[PDB]
Amino acid sequence: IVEGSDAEIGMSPWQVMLFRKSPQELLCGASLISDRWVLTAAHCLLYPPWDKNFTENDLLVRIGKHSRTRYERNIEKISMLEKIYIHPRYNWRENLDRDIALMKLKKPVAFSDYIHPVCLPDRETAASLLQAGYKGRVTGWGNLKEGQPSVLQVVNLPIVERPVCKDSTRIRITDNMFCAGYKPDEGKRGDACEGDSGGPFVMKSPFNNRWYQMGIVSWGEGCDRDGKYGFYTHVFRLKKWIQKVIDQF
């Protein structure tokens, strides 16, 4: 995260760390959406251009963490993967369209003060809060600049108008994507960065006061560059895919 702050303890109890077994190291962000389902970006697991294609057996998810590197005894839980599911139309060849994946844990994770699922939005929550100007929050252990944080980092970011997202890049942006970030104008700044990938873009509903994951950290051009904005997978847009996978398995 660029230009963000240390998280408070318990602040993002749904925050999940994707971890490489050997070499042990951070893979990506991710989130907890029930007791054995973890939501992340497809490109965390599959990205042929960089020779990324993981299997279940190559990974663990580390739930309830605060510190990046330390094995938080008595606090974090670490689970194994029953099965990786990637969106069957995820577009890694062109623009990361539908950048999304589900992970089933081998056994259920025990909820605690530091571990708790986030909600997934409903059309109406999605319709009400997915508005230019509306701020969401992004969290992750990724780069601090376009180095590494000691603890989970956090930044709040405004959702940017669609033509501005579009006018900010050469890539083709779709309806399964949104962008967030301040303008050069707005003085304030902040952004996700490499290693934040697959983490949650969440919002707090003013209607029922629960947190909803509206987005997944997906991509950008540099980190925290003026006139550039971060791109997020539009979680409501693919929720019928999320439900299908969940129902079926």
């Binding site: 050997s22 042990q24 190291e25 663990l60 590197t69 094995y71």
Partner: peptide, 10 residues
């Protein structure tokens, strides 16, 4: 840089 996660989980 990463503290040894337990052996068990691996």
């Amino acid at each position: 840089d990463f503290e040894e996660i337990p052996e068990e989980y691996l």
